[PDB]
Amino acid sequence: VLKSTQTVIHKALEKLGYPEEVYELLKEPMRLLTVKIPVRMDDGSVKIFTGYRAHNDSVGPTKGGIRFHPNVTEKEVKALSIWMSLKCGIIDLPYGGGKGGIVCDPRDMSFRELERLSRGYVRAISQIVGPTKDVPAPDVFTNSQIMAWMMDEYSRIDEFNSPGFITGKPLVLGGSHGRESATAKGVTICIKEAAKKRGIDIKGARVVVQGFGNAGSYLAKFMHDAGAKVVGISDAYGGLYDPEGLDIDYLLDRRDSFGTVTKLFNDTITNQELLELDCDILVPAAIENQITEENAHNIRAKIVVEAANGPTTLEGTKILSDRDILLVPDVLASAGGVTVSYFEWVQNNQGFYWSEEEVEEKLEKMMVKSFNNIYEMANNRRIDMRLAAYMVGVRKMAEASRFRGWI
Amino acid sequence: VLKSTQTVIHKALEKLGYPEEVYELLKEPMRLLTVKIPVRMDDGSVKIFTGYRAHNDSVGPTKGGIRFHPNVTEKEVKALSIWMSLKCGIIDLPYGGGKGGIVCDPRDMSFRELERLSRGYVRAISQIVGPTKDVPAPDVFTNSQIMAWMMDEYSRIDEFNSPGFITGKPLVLGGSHGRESATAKGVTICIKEAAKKRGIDIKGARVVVQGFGNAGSYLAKFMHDAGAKVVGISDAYGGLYDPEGLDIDCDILVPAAIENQITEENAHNIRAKIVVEAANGPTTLEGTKILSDRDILLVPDVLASAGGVTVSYFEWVQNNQGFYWSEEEVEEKLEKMMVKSFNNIYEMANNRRIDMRLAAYMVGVRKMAEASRFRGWI
Amino acid sequence: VLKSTQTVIHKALEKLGYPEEVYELLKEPMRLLTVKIPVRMDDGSVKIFTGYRAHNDSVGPTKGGIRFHPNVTEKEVKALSIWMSLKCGIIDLPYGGGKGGIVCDPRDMSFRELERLSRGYVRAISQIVGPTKDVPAPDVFTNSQIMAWMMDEYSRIDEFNSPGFITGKPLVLGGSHGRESATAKGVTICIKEAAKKRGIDIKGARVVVQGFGNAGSYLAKFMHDAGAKVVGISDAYGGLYDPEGLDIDYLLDRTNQELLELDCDILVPAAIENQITEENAHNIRAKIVVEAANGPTTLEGTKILSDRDILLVPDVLASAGGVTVSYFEWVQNNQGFYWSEEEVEEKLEKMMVKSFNNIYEMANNRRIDMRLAAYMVGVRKMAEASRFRGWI
Amino acid sequence: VLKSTQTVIHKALEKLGYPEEVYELLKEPMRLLTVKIPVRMDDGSVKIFTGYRAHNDSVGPTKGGIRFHPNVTEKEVKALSIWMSLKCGIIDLPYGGGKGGIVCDPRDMSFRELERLSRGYVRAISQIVGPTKDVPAPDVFTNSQIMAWMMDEYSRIDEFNSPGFITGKPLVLGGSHGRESATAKGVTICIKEAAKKRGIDIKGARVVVQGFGNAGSYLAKFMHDAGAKVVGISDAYGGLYDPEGLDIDCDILVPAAIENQITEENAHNIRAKIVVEAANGPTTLEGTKILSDRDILLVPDVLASAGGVTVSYFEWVQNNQGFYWSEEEVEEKLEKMMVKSFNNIYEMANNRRIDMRLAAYMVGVRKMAEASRFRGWI
Amino acid sequence: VLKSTQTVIHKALEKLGYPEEVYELLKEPMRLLTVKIPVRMDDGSVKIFTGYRAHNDSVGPTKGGIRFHPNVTEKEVKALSIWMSLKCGIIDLPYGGGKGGIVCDPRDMSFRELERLSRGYVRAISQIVGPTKDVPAPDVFTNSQIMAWMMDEYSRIDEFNSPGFITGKPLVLGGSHGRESATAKGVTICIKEAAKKRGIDIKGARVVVQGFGNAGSYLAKFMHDAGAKVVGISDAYGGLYDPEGLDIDYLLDRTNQELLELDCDILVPAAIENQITEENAHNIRAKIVVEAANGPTTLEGTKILSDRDILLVPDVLASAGGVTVSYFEWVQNNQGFYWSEEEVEEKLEKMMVKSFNNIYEMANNRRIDMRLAAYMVGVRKMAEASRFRGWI
């Protein structure tokens, strides 16, 4: 995963004619903080939660969300941090890549516990974090409520309101319009572009979405409202299929806080079958490594847009290319989160807030602009979207690190 | 008195459906600093002035003016700080309410004495105020010069220019265009917007402005220039009426004078379709009800007058950017925010079958209630 | 020399009607830091460089560039810091004047030596500079790379990215679009705006650009593209004249007495000093003279042109394009949001227009030339601020 | 490996009667920072070095050295940070354990390269270290010069002299007298104090020092000067014995050499009444037991060698005062603390019927356990 | 002038065997801030005072006083800042040299005007000074009241009591006991310690104090109380001699050629410059000469005394008592704990003794006079520190 991100960054770097030294510098976050966080549990016990914060690169304050998952690991956190630098390079924000992770399961914890842990996180890392250093955001199993708690904790430490510290905030705390679903909106725009690029009509296109989380659900809905047929949908437990397009309104009706909805049905299919669902546009919005060497040949979509971090492997990606499938890379497709996060941060910087229309417009303009830069450079170079996107998303970081004398 | 403010806060929270605990939180400033400031007087003596700075609620940096007046009281600045939250909530500012006061009589103090006091005041409270913490402004007997001194003092303490510490500054110190007309203009925006709701074209609208003083006269020019038949004005010695329209060089009643003009005793008499308050408490509680029972749209002073606060906010934003807005740019943003504010309040009042006064109070109090809850304070 | 700057300051304050004490305040930088910077040289030796940083006046964060030159002097950086206030006042920036200088010869220093010096310079003055205090920029022999190093160093000291500490940065480090054309464009805006005042349509206006060098050539393309008959240009070996209008495009792609005495509407002296002198001032056929260089017209010439109805746009105002965009970069740094090339352009225009017009109108109301009125406007803001804040 | 340290921590907490949750808290550094440091190499290239800084526990500013070694590992610096807490608890320092490491080989790096790396290291971690936060020191291949560079760098970042950021500095930069002899002297104090407990006059005491290397030779001079019959010494090629006493110019055995000299295979053979470790793990676990079963007093290396840490602490104190101690003043304070420490540990071991090793561990771990509980962490 | 200080610095470094580059580093303050301070005068006017603050070298927080005098010059405060390093090196303080100066005449300024200036001075330089950066003190026409004002101002800027910013404070503001007698006592310690080196019992030692002014009279009481035969004193109108010993307590309650040529063990020139010259250096009967004033002995005289076995204790070492106690005040400020009069005394002694002995022993080992050796010891510490920190 990290190993893979590094091959493509290396290839990217080299393809641009960079000294090996630049790869060496970018291949891993320059600063990784891992922390132990004591948490008073409701049962009167005390549990030590392990946290991570990664700063890939500082040529710009680092930016990236914090996830709460049992399967989070230091390795994942580094790789996620590197993604983010690329996303910010790709969209062209004054950010470096960062990410956070706390080994825990919010499904097994209480509202109060999550707050204590949230506040515990900020207290462990406040020193290397803040409006001007490193701005976090939601990610897996975190929401605006967790951002609000953390923001509050940071503000009490700096002794004044520090909205810019962390993005994805509630509107009333200097949050931005459009952030809540920004990720999906970002994938949507990316789908529309890829569709228009392939001569595919969204009006009746069949779209399969793996994962029904915050990115997955809002996405499916945006595709539904775009008039698309969302035929395949899934959470961790399985998929739902309807060649005529699932009742999305209903599916996110039965949906719970954690994005599961599969259990309510008995006619469910497996997640690996879902990935082979006959369709135009496949949207991996779940866990990593879903398109490997052993199913890349079996996917029926001519367009695959990565809403999730690292959903397809190297060979998975090469194969997708060998057989003329259009793959919009994660470092592009999933970057609506940061982009709107970034707006939120500008608004925090200024103390003045944008309308939904202004966010929607700026968001669209930058993504479209980013898709085209990548799609075109992938053309001119006889290379895939991955390598192309990476080349776009590494440009600034490599140039800035050079200007500033690090390499 | 202070309880009057708390009654409003309670009523409003009540209607929103917030638990009693939220009221308990919001009923007093979460932070009050009262200070003693030694000032060297010109006569060689030394006088100790008592100052207060109140931060009602911190769901955003606090914001509010400082008055120099013999009769200012801790209880008063507390109360006023809360009202600032309301306004800030009403305009949807990224602020919380704050307020300052010094027990003194500027009218009996010299120029250099007032400066010493101003600097002393900042020296006393610097620890808890600033561009990111608490942004004062002018009030009763304070002005741009006082603001300047305070800004200079605060900047010395930070060791760098801190324009955004305090608003109402002179233009050269990072002040903002459009202060002079801020309040009046804010009223005009509420009047126009109220017109739209009642399907009343401004171009022929019969407008009545009580008080041809300072804000009144201004409002009259604004309607007459907007093509309204300003069919009536009044100062302190009666009024002028002319159905054809008075050449300032009914549909809308703008009470721009004193309190208790619209009472139970004459509320049923009001011919106007819209009443936009351009002054403090022109209409009693009954009158407000009566007008409500009748289909008369009553635009609350707390919303109508928020123009001043809004532009003070713009100054702070400009300070943050280090970039300063043209007179037109100030104007349009002032409009968008007033319109946005009028409409949120109008629509809540419409949906909830209550007057705009009460709905403004809810909107003024709701934001810091949501924020305080989000941040785990309640 | 430094007194020359002080004379201007005095004259301008004089006319505004400020008391002598205000001049006394503004005549010198309220703050001067001179430092000794040890640099490890490649030859193994150690050389101690002398650096200066001057803050003229603090009615806003100070702003101004740093030059690396063998001949830079404390007296010079002092003088220059004051000129920066003037410009800042002229453009109405929320700045005060500042200026830096290091006694060194970059031409004889290696890449890694220049970096060491740059970092040492920041290390030396970090205490009194920063995004909210004093914002340097490039000058004589300093560039975006030097700016980058300095920015990196300052950021290390704050322990966080501080783009707004120093302007003229590379784009990736939070620099701003529209630096390259800043000055030239600022001139063009003054030219157009001057046209409007004299009721001169640009679309047929006979334009004369002296110096077909770097800014001159640019100005020619701008008028020719704006539909002006660029009826004349000149480099160092004479000039071209053509009443019909010279196709500048034909020339990008490929006497001096006479060029200036050409029958034209707009004369843009974009060359050297003392072209417009008492000896030929009455000869100038142009209705408008917009300076695109330093001191092209002597003091007499300025008067003569004034006595005649010739509108003379002062270099100090015409060239403020560079400073203005450096300011935009700082603003963008404050926002953490970066402006499109077009957005930079329009703001550059609005400020130049606003500035031209304040200065033009003061000159008109007060029956004086634009030079003097610019000086008043350049000096008036910090005089008002300093008084408001109780310094005088 | 790291678990070895954790086993000790667990065992010690176990015996103190702390709940499992305390162990969970103390088993890992509450804070680990790992950094990548670009260094310009002399050959023109650029090498990225990996650095770590670990803060075990914050019940006081953390304290611990930095090693430059090809084989240093994150797991190692973590482990070592914990051992620093133990020592700090043992000496009763107002510290918590911290530790640094850079993966590099100083032996292959030039003078100017090592400086760049040192500055880069400080630049990388400056945010979480400092005189009040985390105080590094020299270790494996780091020295006073490296300390100096790091101190200079940190001072530049604070914009003022920060001697107390890092210890082991040269005297001119605020270093402390008595570093050279710190460890050795600490041993001598434990030896004398152990003597007192066993009613053994030093003046005639037969002393045996294994290893006549650097610390061994020193210890021999100290006993011989104290009037002990240093009846035996040894280097790597055997030993000297002389009942009359060897003129360095048994009662006490001071193993000052290598690990596993005192094993189950010979533990019953030891004639000495007191064994004071002046090196790392000279006695196996069994041997420690055997000596315990026999009435042989075994002074633990972790306590005996705490001289170095203690003087590094003195340097930090002097830095705080901005006042520097005479060589004698350092000596006496070093003694009082070692004596105080020896005695707390001896008495706990006596009261609780356990060896000094285990009791030292308890005392080393108990302080941060009490502090962490007092501060509501557990 | 400033070169005189630099000559000493060079000579001393020279002898230590430091390369020329070290001298280049130490020859000027690495940091000089000169400021313009607007003060509202009582007559309603506004006067702009010029102030300087110099940090010679940063191998420790800088330390040094501020003088208010019409004749203070940038060159002077620079020079003086360097001398402070020397003293600091001599006493082994964790300091570097610093110095302040304001061009003004306190004698013509009112009480409230002097306060405004003092606050303005702190306001001007606050960015680069403070308890951890640069610690001023009183000098020529400044006192504890001025110190108090400055301390109050600085504390306001930090928003907390910062006693350690500036020394020489009144006791209630965190000043230190033992200032009054600091210098005199430091001399006495050098005298006693010099005695020990020459095997001279104090109890019968014939002591001669030139100048029965303020420090002289004090020194006389100290020897007479220590059991020395103060066989001679002098003011400005000749001297008293009495082999049996003058009862200074009489004299205390209530010529110069001869007073100096008097048969004695210890000669303490506590008066003016150039008393010990080539013209009379061979005449001096004393075995030890301890300077209690500035430059009492010419360069030749210093040599002559050296050739003869006469021990000459340098003023720069003998007078370091004042600086030392100012340092104690700063330490106490750091601790927030204040020392008894006795505790100050003993620490003052230990440091003076330690200092005398390092300097004496270097002079003995290196076959040179104590003057030169003091200079080496005064300059050596910041040279070692600067090298350790990679500045040279």
UniProtKB/Swiss-Prot annotation, chain A:
Q: Where is this site: Important for catalysis?
A: 139
Stored SUPFAM superfamilies: Aminoacid dehydrogenase-like, N-terminal domain, NAD(P)-binding Rossmann-fold domains
Entry's PROSITE patterns? GLFV_DEHYDROGENASE
The record's annotation in InterPro entries points to:
Aminoacid_DH-like_N_sf (IPR046346), Glu/Leu/Phe/Val/Trp_DH (IPR006095), Glu/Leu/Phe/Val/Trp_DH_C (IPR006096), Glu/Leu/Phe/Val/Trp_DH_dimer (IPR006097), Glu/Leu/Phe/Val_DH_AS (IPR033524), Glu_DH (IPR014362), NAD(P)-bd_dom_sf (IPR036291), NAD_bind_Glu_DH (IPR033922)
- Active site location: 99 (proton donor)
Which keywords does this Swiss-Prot/TrEMBL entry list?
NAD, Oxidoreductase
For the biological process aspect of GO, one term held by this record is:
amino acid metabolic process
Its induction, per UniProt? Constitutively expressed.
Pfam families for the chain: ELFV_dehydrog (PF00208), ELFV_dehydrog_N (PF02812)
EC numbers for this chain: 1.4.1.2
Q: Which residues bind NAD(+)?
A: 183, 214
**What function is annotated for this protein?**
GudB seems to be intrinsically inactive, however spontaneous mutations removing a 9-bp direct repeat within the wild-type gudB sequence activated the GudB protein and allowed more-efficient utilization of amino acids of the glutamate family (called gutB1). This 3 amino acid insertion presumably causes severe destabilization of the fold of the protein, leading to an inactive enzyme that is very quickly degraded.
Family to which this protein belongs? Belongs to the Glu/Leu/Phe/Val dehydrogenases family.
Q: Please state what the protein is called.
A: Cryptic catabolic NAD-specific glutamate dehydrogenase GudB
* Primary gene name: gudB
Curated annotation (Swiss-Prot), chains C, E:
* A molecular-function term among this protein's GO annotations: glutamate dehydrogenase (NAD+) activity
What positions does the entry give for NAD(+) binding? Answer: 183, 214
Please tell me whether the keyword NAD is annotated for this protein. yes
Name any one Pfam family assigned in the record: ELFV_dehydrog
What induces its synthesis?
Constitutively expressed.
Name the enzyme's class.
oxidoreductase
Instruction: Please give the function described in this protein's UniProt entry.
Output: GudB seems to be intrinsically inactive, however spontaneous mutations removing a 9-bp direct repeat within the wild-type gudB sequence activated the GudB protein and allowed more-efficient utilization of amino acids of the glutamate family (called gutB1). This 3 amino acid insertion presumably causes severe destabilization of the fold of the protein, leading to an inactive enzyme that is very quickly degraded.
* The family this protein is said to belong to: Belongs to the Glu/Leu/Phe/Val dehydrogenases family.
Name-wise, this protein is Cryptic catabolic NAD-specific glutamate dehydrogenase GudB
